[PDB]
Write a protein that binds this ligand. Structure first.
Ligand SMILES: [K+]
Ligand SMILES: [K+]
Ligand SMILES: [K+]
Ligand SMILES: [K+]
Ligand SMILES: [K+]
Ligand SMILES: [K+]
Ligand SMILES: [K+]
Ligand SMILES: [K+]
Ligand SMILES: [K+]
Ligand SMILES: [K+]
Ligand SMILES: [K+]
Ligand SMILES: [K+]
Ligand SMILES: [K+]
Ligand SMILES: [K+]
Ligand SMILES: [Mg+2]
Ligand SMILES: [Mg+2]
Ligand SMILES: [Mg+2]
Ligand SMILES: [Mg+2]
Ligand SMILES: [Mg+2]
Ligand SMILES: [Mg+2]
Ligand SMILES: [Mg+2]
Ligand SMILES: [Mg+2]
Ligand SMILES: [Mg+2]
Ligand SMILES: [Mg+2]
Ligand SMILES: [Mg+2]
Ligand SMILES: [Mg+2]
Ligand SMILES: [Mg+2]
Ligand SMILES: [Mg+2]
Ligand SMILES: [Mg+2]
Ligand SMILES: [Mg+2]
Ligand SMILES: [Mg+2]
Ligand SMILES: [Mg+2]
Ligand SMILES: [Mg+2]
Ligand SMILES: [Mg+2]
Ligand SMILES: [Mg+2]
Ligand SMILES: [Mg+2]
Ligand SMILES: [Mg+2]
Ligand SMILES: [Mg+2]
Ligand SMILES: [Mg+2]
Ligand SMILES: [Mg+2]
Ligand SMILES: [Mg+2]
Ligand SMILES: [Mg+2]
Ligand SMILES: [Mg+2]
Ligand SMILES: [Mg+2]
Ligand SMILES: [Mg+2]
Ligand SMILES: [Mg+2]
Ligand SMILES: [Mg+2]
Ligand SMILES: [Mg+2]
Ligand SMILES: [Mg+2]
Ligand SMILES: [Mg+2]
Ligand SMILES: [Mg+2]
Ligand SMILES: [Mg+2]
Lengths: 184, 184, 261
RNA sequence: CCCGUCGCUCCUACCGAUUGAAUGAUCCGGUGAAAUGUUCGGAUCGCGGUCGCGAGAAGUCCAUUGAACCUUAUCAUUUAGAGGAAGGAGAAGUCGUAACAAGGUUUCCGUAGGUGAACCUGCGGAAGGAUCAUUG
RNA sequence: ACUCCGCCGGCACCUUAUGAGAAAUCAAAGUUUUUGGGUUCCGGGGGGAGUAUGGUCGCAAGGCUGAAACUUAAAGGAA
RNA sequence: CGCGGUAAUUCCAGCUCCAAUAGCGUAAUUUAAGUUGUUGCAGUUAAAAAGCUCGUAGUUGGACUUUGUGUUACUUUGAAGAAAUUAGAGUGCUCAAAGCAAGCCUACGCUCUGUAUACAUUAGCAUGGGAUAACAUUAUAGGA
RNA sequence: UACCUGGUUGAUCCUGCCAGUAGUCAUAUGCUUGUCUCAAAGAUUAAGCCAUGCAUGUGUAAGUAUGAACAAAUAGACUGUGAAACUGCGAAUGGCUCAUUAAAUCAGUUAUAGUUUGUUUGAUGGUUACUCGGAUAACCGUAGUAAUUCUAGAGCUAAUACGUGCACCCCGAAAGGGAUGCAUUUAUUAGAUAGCGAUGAUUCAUGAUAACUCGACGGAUCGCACGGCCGCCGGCGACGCAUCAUUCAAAUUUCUGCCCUAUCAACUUUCGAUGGUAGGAUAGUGGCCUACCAUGGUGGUGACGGGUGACGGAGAAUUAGGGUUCGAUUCCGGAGAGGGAGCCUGAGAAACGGCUACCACAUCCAAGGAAGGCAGCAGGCGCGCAAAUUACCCAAUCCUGACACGGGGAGGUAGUGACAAUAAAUAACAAUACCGGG
């Protein structure tokens, strides 16, 4: 099957390598997951070397995404793949791979923001909410996309390896970089 | 694998480089007939053994006299020559090992000592006595004429207790003749 | 090979076992255990080749299956159990108790012990690190793991382990001036005072050891085992006391023995 | 003493029309078993309240790995060949006499032409020449 | 211009062996079994043969590179 | 190399003698071979100096610096290094090739019995030495 | 033993080779052969083809007995032994061979801060439950087929089989609630200094926090012994699950090192060649693979290609020294199982005394099908100059399983055996006759 050996490669000088042994099981590869965004979740269990387990996600719809500046992580629905640095064909096929830029539902984070800062984007409770409002700062670029209900996010997990699609909300100069790539 | 394959074995003689040198043929036949040897092979293995001893001494003599290996193995070689009666306590130097000859080794043979101690009438009579189980070195019967006697063992050479010449009953020739005489 | 080798050819066995080359095609394959297979002495060798209690491979199994042999205070029934340096072997029926120590020629010697001294052993500390829940632990070179060790204990130190309480009674820091034994290499079995430590970043650390008679020899840190603080070891040593004699000196003793004996 | 053609026998190798042949390998291309992943499929079984839930075979779809076979091409090795032609060997063939003496035209090198054959001739060179020598 | 003494460089010659060499002979062809200053090319019995083949150069003549099968107990150097 | 052509020391035989001897003859490779030459060969005439010169890589390069954190080679010592084989210590398997045993006395046993040691290119690792040698460097000192 | 001798001439001194001389753990063959010890043996040509038999199975007091099994007893679940069968484990070691393979294998030397690792050993696993459910084997009895450890249906019943299941922070009218074992995935945060661990060196070990997963995890198991409290409590073991360390190992990997050939001088790169970025895949690093980008990489210090009657090494023969030649074969490493490819199971295999396919060979058939892999041991054919018994045994060495006990063509024993090696008979003595010397 798929093999990760170097025997089929050319030498650094350019000469060929004559085969001196058959393929080994301990140097195999496997078919890519090609995880897609779909509400029909499907993750198949793969037995790997040592009797260990890998989770190969064929279809996913939700992910665990973290708002780094706010230090809050929420499970949210994945809406769309918008950018992929490796292959633009993975964008129109809606493939979920590590480091792909996706849009996630902003609703779970809005609820936390309202519950935490008391703002939309009980005597002892109002005492602390206003206290936390003193040091409240929200990026203009990050707030502008709360109106549409979608947040740009980057997948930080490997769905074909762990079976999950987790990530973090884009912000700072990383958000500026990617939103300029989408400005066409 | 067979364990017997690990048993060592070696050669005990080399044939001459020049097969028909009249001088050598004359000298070798004189030693063969003097010491009652079976063939030239018995003389060639003694020369082979002597060459090994001399070669060891030459290597030691080429080293510094303060070299620990020179001191340790040199003493062992001298001790070995003394224990067989080849060297004397007054010849405790490696240079005297280089002066050894074939006659020195042939004089330590059991065949030679059985003859020169008076037990046998001729060097050829000693040969037959040894192979016929009439001699013993201490308590052990020895039927090998090439047995190299040690100085500490030379005084214990005597007839075997089972021999007609050492207290045993008469052989089968006298016994049959006695039986025939009795029948008369 | 497609996996693990289960056989040990006799000529490939460690030389310090002193197995005769024509005794058979195979040697006992040491089982997995606290000590490495090249630095151990399987119980079958001890019971049959060293102590002569067993005459055959079969008889060693009979002895062990009666639960008559203990290693580090616990009964062992595995014929190829890898007993190693500082291990305490006890045989209650014979009232015997030995400690596995190297003689000055690099071979394991069954050093008979007194009943009092057979209640502990020395172990060399491999490393100290935090485990799960931030609990510190240390592991040794005999496969043991001790949780909540004294904070002063560090790598390469020696700990005195009580075989009954299974706790660290005392430890010796690895430092210049202590008496150590060499547990590997050319100088295996030699005892001396650690005189110097030469560190080389990224490379092995060399230690210079001086014998009681002034003979100095070097070796790698991994082959050193501290035996005591200062100059007195915490364990009983064999007759040689780690003093390696020259072949000339050894021959001198042998010659004198024949004159007297 | 000795050179070559020619003539006879045998042995080794070479050239050679045959778009020679055989065998093996490799590249590209074509076709493509099986397996695996995917898609669809839902025989059948079980479990709940004649509708749900779960499991799921055959088969099917796309992809991957890819044997195998079939081309053209290339390479490798072996081998046939009318005829041409080289060398060597083979007691005591034919024709001369070229090399050895100044060998009867001193020999030899390079090159060119010519002749049954060795060889001959032209031009330049060498002595390994048959001259170490003309202040005559 | 010629005569005499000398220095450096060059083409050579003559005598000689304390040298070398199989010798002829050589003042280098010497300072080599008492074997080593540096470096390039190149030979390994006689033939087959500077031939066959492939490559390369040339208008050609040919040049450069360059085998094997097989054959033979000598061929050869100096005296 | 030669023997045999009517007086064969050489063929076929007998006899006798010779060599090795339970072995000996016949049909790739080492030695001999200083006929592959690093040690250590040849090239005037025996086989062998390119017709001549230039020329890059390669190889080889004068003398000089203390006697009385530039980088390397070299040398010294050490560490690490499978066994078996080789060398070698001990040991009377009856000797031997071997083997790794055994020995001591006569008790309910002993010698902690022995099962040494050396060698092991090159490369790598680590100390000491700094002659010889290689590379790098130097004057608008970016100097100490 | 640091050695030479014959051969060119009428004779001489040379060059030079031919021939002789000696060895080979070096093969074959010829003739010959009494004894002791030791001992190689279908590698060379054909990794050619194989009849037959055997070479891997496995049971403890301790997973599961209702044999319609045996033995001994005599209103009880069982509890003497135990075939069969399920379950568990092993069969990835060993043995064989040298075909392919020339910086590759391999050797010494490194690295994993770049990974996986059944087992062993050590440590560590939170503050209906007096015990759940449905199946199935053996057995039983209807069978099919020419036929195979080929196969269908029916009736029963077990489990350590299978499927289940008791088992600090945030919100906040400080009540209450959420999360709260271990593991999994992502993000934020601490991991100082010179309370606070390690390294030559790590945002490392490890901690805290926010969530996440539709998590084979966190014991529905077995033997023995009976005791102590007044139903309660409790001993010593077996087996099993998870985590870390350890051990047994592998995978990949650093540096240096390999024979002949230039009548092989350029090679590599569209379809990965060299490197970069982002992914995918993998136990994990890596053009290992994909997308995009750059134009690199190697070479007279011999790349690339070709040859090898080339597995590499430890080593073997011969050796004054230097050297030459050999290295299929018992130790180590690698590789293969007629040729390729693919794969399941599993901790571990691209396994072949496992499976699937193709190709090549070839067996049985009632012609509808079915079963094949001796470069394991012995044996046969063929090939050849060239190589043994279709033997006995697990007693030794050791390996393996549930196991003190079973099994082992591994291994040993004997047979054949002038491969090779060791010791060593085939006469000794005396008197006569004969013949010498001092
Ligand atoms: K492997
Ligand atoms: K003429
Ligand atoms: K002439
Ligand atoms: K003419
Ligand atoms: K002049
Ligand atoms: K010499
Ligand atoms: K298994
Ligand atoms: K290596
Ligand atoms: K190599
Ligand atoms: K990888
Ligand atoms: K890359
Ligand atoms: K398994
Ligand atoms: K056995
Ligand atoms: K067993
Ligand atoms: Mg194997
Ligand atoms: Mg390190
Ligand atoms: Mg004429
Ligand atoms: Mg004329
Ligand atoms: Mg003329
Ligand atoms: Mg002169
Ligand atoms: Mg010379
Ligand atoms: Mg020639
Ligand atoms: Mg006659
Ligand atoms: Mg003759
Ligand atoms: Mg020659
Ligand atoms: Mg010569
Ligand atoms: Mg001439
Ligand atoms: Mg000439
Ligand atoms: Mg100089
Ligand atoms: Mg010589
Ligand atoms: Mg003549
Ligand atoms: Mg010869
Ligand atoms: Mg007898
Ligand atoms: Mg079973
Ligand atoms: Mg090649
Ligand atoms: Mg390399
Ligand atoms: Mg960390
Ligand atoms: Mg990458
Ligand atoms: Mg690409
Ligand atoms: Mg080879
Ligand atoms: Mg081959
Ligand atoms: Mg080999
Ligand atoms: Mg072969
Ligand atoms: Mg074999
Ligand atoms: Mg092997
Ligand atoms: Mg394999
Ligand atoms: Mg076959
Ligand atoms: Mg296979
Ligand atoms: Mg088989
Ligand atoms: Mg197998
Ligand atoms: Mg034979
Ligand atoms: Mg006879």
């Amino acid at each position: 099957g798929i093999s990760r050996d170097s025997m089929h490669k050319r030498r650094a000088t350019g000469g060929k390598k004559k085969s001196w042994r058959k393929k080994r099981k301990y140097e195999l590869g496997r078919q890519p997951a090609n995880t897609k965004i779909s509400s029909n979740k499907t993750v198949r269990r793969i037995r790997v070397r040592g009797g260990n387990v890998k989770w190969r996600a064929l279809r996913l719809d939700t992910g665990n995404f973290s708002w780094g500046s706010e230090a809050v992580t929420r499970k949210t629905r994945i809406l769309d793949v918008v950018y992929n640095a490796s292959n633009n064909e993975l964008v129109r096929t809606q493939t979920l791979v590590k480091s792909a830029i996706v849009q996630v539902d902003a609703a779970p984070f809005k609820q936390w923001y309202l519950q935490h800062y008391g703002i939309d984007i009980s005597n002892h409770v109002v005492r602390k909410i206003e206290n936390r409002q003193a040091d409240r700062k929200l990026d203009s670029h990050l707030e502008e996309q709360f109106a549409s209900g979608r947040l740009l996010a980057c997948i930080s997990s490997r769905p074909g390896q762990c079976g999950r699609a987790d990530g973090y909300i884009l912000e700072g100069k990383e958000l500026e970089f990617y939103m300029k790539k989408l400005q066409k | 694998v067979h364990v017997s394959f690990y048993r060592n074995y070696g050669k005990t003689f080399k044939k001459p480089r020049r097969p028909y040198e009249k001088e050598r043929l004359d000298a070798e036949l004189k030693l063969v007939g003097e010491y009652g040897l079976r063939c030239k092979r018995e003389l060639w293995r003694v020369q082979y053994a002597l060459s090994r001893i001399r070669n060891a001494a030459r290597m030691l003599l080429t080293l510094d006299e303060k070299d620990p290996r020179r001191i340790f193995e040199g003493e062992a070689l001298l001790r070995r020559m003394n224990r067989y009666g080849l060297l004397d306590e007054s010849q405790n130097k490696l240079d005297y090992v280089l002066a050894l000859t074939v006659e020195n080794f042939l004089e330590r043979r059991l065949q030679t000592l059985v003859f020169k101690t008076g037990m046998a009438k001729s060097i050829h009579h000693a040969r037959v006595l040894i192979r016929q189980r009439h001699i013993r070195v201490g308590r052990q019967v020895v039927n090998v004429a090439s047995f190299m006697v040690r100085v500490d063992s030379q005084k214990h050479i005597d007839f075997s207790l089972t021999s007609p010449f050492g207290g045993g009953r008469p052989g089968r020739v006298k016994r049959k003749n006695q039986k025939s005489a009795a029948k008369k | 090979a497609r996996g693990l080798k289960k056989h040990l050819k006799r000529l490939n066995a460690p030389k310090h076992w002193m197995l005769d080359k024509l005794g058979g095609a195979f040697a006992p394959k040491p089982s997995s255990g606290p000590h490495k297979s090249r630095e151990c002495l399987p119980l079958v060798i001890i019971l049959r080749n060293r102590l002569k209690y067993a005459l055959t491979y079969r008889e060693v199994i009979s002895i062990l299956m009666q639960r008559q042999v203990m290693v580090d205070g616990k009964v062992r029934t595995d014929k190829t159990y890898p007993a190693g340096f500082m291990d305490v072997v006890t045989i209650p029926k014979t009232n015997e108790s030995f400690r596995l120590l190297y003689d000055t020629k690099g071979r394991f010697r069954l050093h008979s012990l007194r009943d009092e001294e057979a209640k502990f052993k020395l172990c060399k500390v491999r490393s100290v690190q935090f485990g799960q829940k931030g609990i510190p632990y240390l592991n040794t070179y005999d496969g043991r793991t001790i949780r909540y060790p004294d904070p002063l204990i560090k790598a390469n130190d020696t700990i005195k382990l009580d075989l009954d309480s299974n706790k660290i009674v005392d430890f010796i820091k690895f430092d210049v001036g202590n008496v150590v034994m060499v547990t590997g290499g050319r100088n295996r079995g030699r005892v001396g005072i650690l005189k110097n430590r030469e560190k080389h970043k990224g490379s092995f650390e060399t230690v210079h050891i001086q014998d009681s008679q002034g003979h100095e020899f070097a070796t790698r840190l991994g082959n050193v085992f501290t035996l005591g603080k200062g100059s007195k070891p915490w364990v009983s040593l064999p007759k040689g006391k780690g003093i390696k004699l020259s072949i000339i000196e050894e021959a001198r003793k042998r010659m004198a023995a024949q004159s007297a004996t």
